[PDB]
Structure formats: C-alpha cells, structure tokens
Amino acid sequence: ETFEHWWSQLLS
C-alpha cells in the first residue's frame, strides 16, 4: 500500500 493509505487509517 501507499504511505497515504497506511497513514490515513491510523486510529481506525
């Protein structure tokens, strides 16, 4: 996955 994919889902 991309950095954005991983980051956007922190705390989900």
Next chain:
Amino acid sequence: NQVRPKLPLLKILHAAGAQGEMFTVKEVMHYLGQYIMVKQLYDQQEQHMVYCGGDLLGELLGRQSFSVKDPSPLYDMLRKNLVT
C-alpha cells in the same frame, strides 16, 4: 474537543502548513502525515517505513525510524506532546 501541541511538535506541524496552536486529534494527524509526505521521509518501496533520523521528527520520537503499520512509538510521542 482540542489539544495543544508542545513546542517541538507544533513547529513540525507548522512546517507542514498548520496554522494556530489548538487542533483536533485528526488535525494533528493530518499535518503530521503531510510533514512526512512533503519531506518524503518514507521509503518508496516499503511506504509504511519512515526514516526520521537527522530530522526534528526523529529527535522528538526518540527514534531514527518507525513503521506506520506499528504506530505505538508515534502514539507514545503524541501522548507526551499533546495537552488536553
């Protein structure tokens, strides 16, 4: 409803385009991700890998690297640098 980042973290957020000193949790997370993205601290092949050695982010995290897939160190830094 909002938190106040301690100075070391606020400078990093400002450098990512944050304005002000009071933010929501998601706001803090957004600018922090933009900081990492802009400065391209993540690896191109393993994008969950972030190398922060030699950057103020690494000095604040107490690490030369971390994985977004195991955010514990990130959340630990936030608990130490965000005030309700």
